[PDB]
C-alpha cells in the first residue's frame, strides 16, 4: 500500500526532471525550461496533497544530498513524523545509468552533479511549505540556508531562473509571519531581508536576466510602500533597470501598479493615470488575477476623484465586482453635488473598509475635491455669474471664502476664468476657437510616433521564431 | 394573458385616482374565472410591495390595499382543482390513448401543442414547455414552430421575464427561418425591442419598432392599442427632429393610431409644438403623456424619469440651433418655467457632454456653442487614435 504510493509520484517527478536536465546541458536552451517551470508550480501543488507527503522523502534518497539530509528530518519533525522504511538508502532508482546520475562516478567525486540537483532541491522544499502553511521556526531556518548557498554558487544564464522564483517565497513567508504575530524578532528579521535584496540585485544586473530582475523589483517596491519611504523609492525607479522585453504580462501589471501609488502622493496624476490603465490592460482577466484586478480597480477610481474628474457610473454597474465597489460609489455622488455633510457621513461608516487597503488617507484629500469639483461644474455651465450666487447653491460660508477657493484652482489651469472685483462677477476666460492654434498639433506629433512604437517592437518578433523553424528538417 | 397583466399593472403605482385600479379590477375578476391567473394572481403581492403587495390570505396574512379583490377565497380554491381536472386530466387521458394506439405522428404532436395551451390557462409554465418538448422533435413546418414560441412569448408578458424569453426566440429563428407575414416577423422583431426597454438600450429598442406595422395584434400576447403605444411613443424619444418629420408626424399608419384612440396625445401634441416652435404649451403636454400614457403602460415604467428629462434636454437644443443666442425673459418666463427651475434643468445637461451652450446672469443672454471647424476632426479624431490603439495591441502583446 504505502510502498506503491511512494514510487508512483517519484517516477513522475523524475520524468519532469529529466526533461529540463538534458536541455540545460547542451548549449543554452534555457528559454524552453522556463515554459516547463510555469506548469511545474501547478502540477506539483496538486500532487503534494495526493500520496501524502512521502513523494519528497524518497526523492532525496535517490540523488545525492549536499545539505538536504537534515532538512527533510527537520521538515518532518514539526509534523510528528510517522516512520515507515525511513532509514536512508531504502529506495534506489539509479542502478548505474547515465541519465540516472551514475553512482560510482558520483560517490568518487570525479564529477559534479550537485549544481543542478541542489538548486532544484530547494525549489521543491519551498512548495510544500506554502502548501502546508508551515510557519515559525521552519520559515527562519530555511532562510539561513538558501541565501548563503546562492552566494557560493555561480549562477549561469539558465541557473539564474532557478532562484528567481525562490525570492518570492522568501518575502511572502516573512510577511505572513509578521501579520500573524508581532514581536521583536520579526522587525530584526526584515532588516536582513532588506539587506539581501540590495546585494543580489547588483549580481542580477550583470547577468541581465529578465525574469530575475522582474521578480526582485516587484518585491522591492512593495517593501517601500509598507514603510512609507519615498526617497528610497524615488531613486530606485530613476535607474530603469526593468526589462520590458521577455518579462511576463503578470509581472508587468504589478510594475505599473506601484508607479500609480508613488505619483499619487506626489500630486502629479498625469503620469499616474496612465500607469493604472496599463496595469489593467497587462493583467489577465482570469480568476487567478482577480486579486490584482480587485485592488487595481479600486485605485483607478481614487486617482480620478483626485484629478477633479468624475469616473463613469457604468464601472460600478456592468462589472460583476460592484459588491466591493459600493463604498466608492457614495464618494462619487458626494463630490458632484458638493454636499459637505454627505461626504463626512460617507467616510464615517465605511472607514473600517477603507483601513484595509490604506485608502482612507487618500480620502482626506477628497474633502477638498468636493468643493473644487462643484466650482468647476458651475463655472463651465455659467460664464458670467455673480459672487453671492455660488454661496446660495453650495451653502458656503461667506463671500470672502468663495473668493479664495476660486483663485486656488486657477493656479494649475483648472477653472480657466478670471475674478473681477470691481464689477463683482466671475467671467469664464475660455472662448474655445483653439482649432486655429497650435495646441492640437502638439498631440498630433506625439500620436505619429505612438503608431510607430508598436512597429519596432513587432517586425523583430517575426524572425525570432523563424530560426529554429527553418533549421529543422521539413518533409 | 396580457390583458390581465396590463390592467393589473395599475395596482402597482397610482398617484392620481384609485378608480383606475377599480376599473382595471373588473378585467382581473372577469378573466380569472375563465382562465386561472394563480401564478400571476399570487405574483401581484410578490412583485411590488408597500402598495397592494401587503394583502394576501395565503402566503403572508396582512391587509394593506386600495383594492380588496386581490384576496383569495373559497371559490378560487375549488376552481383551481376543477380547471386542473377538466382542462388537463380529462384531455391527458385522450392523448394517452393516442400514444398507446399509435395513430399518426404530426397529429399526436399537435395534441400536446393544443393541450399545452390549457397549461397556460391554468398557469403552469413547467408542464407547458414539457408538452411542447415532446412535440418539438416532430415539428417541421412553421405550424408547430411558432406555437412553441407562443408559450415562450407568454413568459415575458405574463410572468414578466425579460431574460429567458428573448434567448429562445433567437434559437427558433435560427432553426427554421421563413418569417411568414409581417406579424410572424414582428414576433421576432417587435417583441425583441420590448425586452430592450427593460435594460435601457436607447435606440436598440426602437430600431425594429419603427419599421413594424401598426396592424400587428396578437390578442393574448399583445393587443392592438398596446403595440400602437409602444411603437408611437418610443419612436418619439429615439428619432431626432430630422426623422420626426417624414416618419412620426407624417405616417400612413401612426396617424391612424392616435386618431382612433385619443388617449395617446403623444405623436400629435408633442410633435406639432416642436414643429411650430411653440414651447409655452409644449411643457404641459409632457404631463398628460407621462401620467396618462407612460405610467399606466407596463414596459414604459422601466425608465420613468428618463423619458421627460431627455425631452427637456432636446426641447432647448432645437432652439439653440436656430439662434446664436437667447434671452432670459423669453426662456425662464415666457415658457412658463422660472429662473431657478430653468437653471436646474440646464445645470446638469452641460456637464454630461450631451450639448454645449453659454449662460449669463447680469446680461441674461443664453448663447449657443457651435463646433465651427472642430466637428469630428477635433475630439473624435484624437479619440480614434487611442480607441484603436488599445484593441490593436491587446491580442498582439500575448503572441500565441
Amino acid at each position: 500500500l504505502h510502498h506503491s504510493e511512494k514510487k508512483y509520484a517519484e517516477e513522475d517527478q523524475v520524468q519532469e526532471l529529466l526533461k529540463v536536465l538534458n536541455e540545460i546541458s547542451k548549449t543554452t536552451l534555457t528559454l524552453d525550461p522556463r515554459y516547463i517551470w510555469r506548469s511545474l508550480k501547478d502540477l506539483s501543488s496538486l500532487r503534494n496533497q495526493e500520496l501524502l507527503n512521502a513523494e519528497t522523502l524518497c526523492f532525496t534518497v535517490n540523488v545525492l544530498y549536499p545539505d538536504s539530509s537534515s532538512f527533510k528530518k527537520n521538515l518532518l519533525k514539526f509534523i510528528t513524523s510517522n516512520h515507515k522504511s525511513s532509514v536512508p538508502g531504502s529506495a534506489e532508482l539509479r542502478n548505474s545509468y547515465p541519465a540516472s546520475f551514475y553512482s560510482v562516478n558520483t560517490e568518487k567525486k570525479t564529477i559534479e552533479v550537485t549544481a543542478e540537483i541542489n538548486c532544484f532541491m530547494h525549489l521543491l522544499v519551498q512548495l510544500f511549505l506554502w502548501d502546508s502553511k508551515e510557519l515559525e521556526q521552519l520559515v527562519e531556518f530555511n532562510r539561513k540556508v538558501v541565501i548563503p548557498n546562492l552566494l557560493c554558487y555561480y549562477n549561469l544564464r539558465s541557473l539564474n531562473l532557478i532562484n528567481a522564483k525562490l525570492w518570492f517565497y522568501i518575502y511572502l513567508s516573512h510577511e505572513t509571519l509578521a501579520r500573524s504575530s508581532e514581536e521583536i524578532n520579526s522587525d530584526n528579521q526584515n532588516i536582513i531581508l532588506r539587506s539581501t535584496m540590495m546585494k543580489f540585485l547588483k549580481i542580477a544586473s550583470l547577468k541581465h536576466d529578465n525574469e530575475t530582475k522582474a521578480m526582485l523589483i516587484n518585491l522591492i517596491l512593495r517593501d517601500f510602500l509598507n514603510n512609507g519611504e519615498v526617497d528610497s523609492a524615488s531613486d530606485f525607479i530613476s535607474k530603469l533597470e526593468y526589462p520590458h522585453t521577455d518579462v511576463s504580462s503578470s509581472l508587468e501589471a504589478r510594475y505599473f501598479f506601484y508607479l500609480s501609488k508613488i505619483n499619487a502622493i506626489q500630486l502629479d496624476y498625469s503620469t499616474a493615470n496612465e500607469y493604472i490603465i496599463a496595469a489593467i490592460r497587462k493583467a489577465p482577466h482570469n480568476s487567478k488575477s482577480l486579486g490584482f484586478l480587485q485592488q487595481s480597480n479600486k485605485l483607478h477610481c481614487c486617482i480620478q476623484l483626485l484629478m477633479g474628474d468624475i469616473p463613469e457610473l457604468s464601472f460600478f454597474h456592468q462589472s460583476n465586482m460592484q459588491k466591493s465597489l459600493l463604498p466608492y460609489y457614495h464618494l462619487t455622488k458626494a463630490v458632484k453635488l458638493g454636499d459637505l455633510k454627505k461626504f463626512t457621513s460617507t467616510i464615517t461608516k465605511y472607514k473600517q473598509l477603507l483601513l484595509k487597503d490604506d485608502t482612507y488617507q487618500l480620502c482626506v484629500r477628497l474633502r477638498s475635491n468636493v468643493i473644487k469639483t462643484g466650482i468647476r461644474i458651475i463655472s463651465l455651465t455659467y460664464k458670467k455669474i455673480s459672487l453671492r450666487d455660488i454661496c446660495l447653491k453650495l451653502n458656503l460660508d461667506s463671500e470672502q471664502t468663495v473668493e479664495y477657493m476660486v483663485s486656488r484652482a486657477i493656479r494649475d489651469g483648472v477653472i480657466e476664468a478670471k475674478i473681477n472685483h470691481e464689477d463683482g462677477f466671475i467671467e469664464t476666460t475660455e472662448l474655445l476657437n483653439i482649432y486655429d492654434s497650435e495646441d492640437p498639433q502638439q498631440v498630433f506629433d506625439e500620436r505619429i510616433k505612438f503608431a510607430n512604437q508598436l512597429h519596432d517592437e513587432y517586425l523583430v518578433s517575426m524572425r525570432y521564431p523563424e530560426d529554429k523553424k527553418t533549421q529543422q528538417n521539413e518533409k | 394573458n396580457y390583458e390581465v397583466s396590463e390592467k393589473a399593472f395599475l395596482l402597482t403605482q397610482s398617484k392620481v385616482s384609485i378608480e383606475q385600479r377599480k376599473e382595471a379590477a373588473e378585467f382581473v375578476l372577469a378573466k380569472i374565472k375563465e382562465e386561472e391567473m394563480a401564478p400571476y394572481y399570487k405574483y401581484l403581492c410578490e412583485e411590488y410591495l408597500v402598495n397592494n403587495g401587503q394583502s394576501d390570505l395565503e402566503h403572508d396574512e396582512k391587509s394593506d390595499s386600495l383594492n380588496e379583490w386581490i384576496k383569495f377565497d373559497q371559490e378560487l380554491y375549488n376552481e383551481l382543482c376543477k380547471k386542473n381536472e377538466s382542462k388537463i386530466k380529462e384531455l391527458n387521458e385522450k392523448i394517452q390513448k393516442l400514444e398507446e394506439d399509435d395513430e399518426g405522428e404530426l397529429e399526436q404532436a399537435q395534441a400536446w401543442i393544443n393541450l399545452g395551451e390549457y397549461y397556460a390557462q391554468i398557469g403552469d409554465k413547467d408542464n407547458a414547455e414539457k408538452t411542447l418538448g415532446k412535440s418539438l422533435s416532430k415539428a417541421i413546418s412553421t405550424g408547430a414552430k411558432i406555437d412553441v414560441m407562443l408559450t415562450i412569448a407568454r413568459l415575458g408578458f405574463f410572468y414578466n421575464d425579460q431574460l429567458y424569453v428573448k434567448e429562445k426566440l433567437e434559437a427558433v429563428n435560427s432553426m427554421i427561418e421563413k418569417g411568414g407575414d409581417w406579424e410572424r416577423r414582428n414576433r421576432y422583431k417587435t417583441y425583441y425591442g420590448i425586452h430592450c426597454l427593460a435594460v435601457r438600450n436607447f435606440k436598440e429598442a426602437a430600431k425594429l419598432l419603427v419599421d413594424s406595422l401598426a396592424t400587428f395584434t396578437s390578442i393574448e400576447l399583445t393587443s392592438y392599442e398596446s403595440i400602437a403605444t409602444y411603437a408611437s411613443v418610443t419612436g418619439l424619444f429615439t428619432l431626432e427632429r430630422t426623422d420626426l418629420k417624414s416618419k412620426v408626424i407624417d405616417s400612413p399608419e401612426l396617424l391612424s393610431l392616435i386618431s382612433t384612440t385619443a388617449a395617446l396625445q403623444s405623436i400629435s401634441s408633442l410633435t406639432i409644438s416642436l414643429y411650430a416652435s411653440d414651447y409655452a404649451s409644449y411643457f404641459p403636454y409632457l404631463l398628460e403623456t407621462y401620467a396618462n400614457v407612460l405610467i399606466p403602460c407596463k414596459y414604459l415604467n422601466r425608465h420613468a424619469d428618463f423619458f421627460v428629462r431627455e425631452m427637456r434636454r432636446k426641447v432647448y437644443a432645437q432652439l439653440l440651433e436656430s439662434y446664436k443666442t437667447l434671452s432670459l425673459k423669453s426662456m425662464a418666463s415666457a415658457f412658463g418655467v422660472s429662473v431657478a427651475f430653468l437653471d436646474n434643468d440646464l445645470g446638469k445637461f452641460i456637464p454630461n457632454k450631451q450639448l454645449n451652450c453659454v449662460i449669463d446672469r447680469v446680461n441674461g443672454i443664453v448663447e449657443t456653442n457651435r463646433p465651427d471647424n472642430k466637428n469630428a476632426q477635433y475630439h473624435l479624431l484624437v479619440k480614434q487614435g487611442d480607441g484603436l490603439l488599445t484593441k490593436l495591441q491587446k491580442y498582439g502583446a500575448a503572441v500565441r
Binding site: 457604468s314 458632484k336 | 398617484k15 411643457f283 424619469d305 428629462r309 427637456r312 412658463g336 418655467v337 422660472s338
Partner: peptide, 27 residues
Amino acid sequence: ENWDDVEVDDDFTNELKAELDRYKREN
C-alpha cells in the same frame, strides 16, 4: 455612462413642474 443611471436626480418629478402652470397666469 457618467452621471446617468443610478444617481438620477431626485427632483423634477411632480411638485416642481406642477407649480409652473400657475406661473403662466401670474404674468
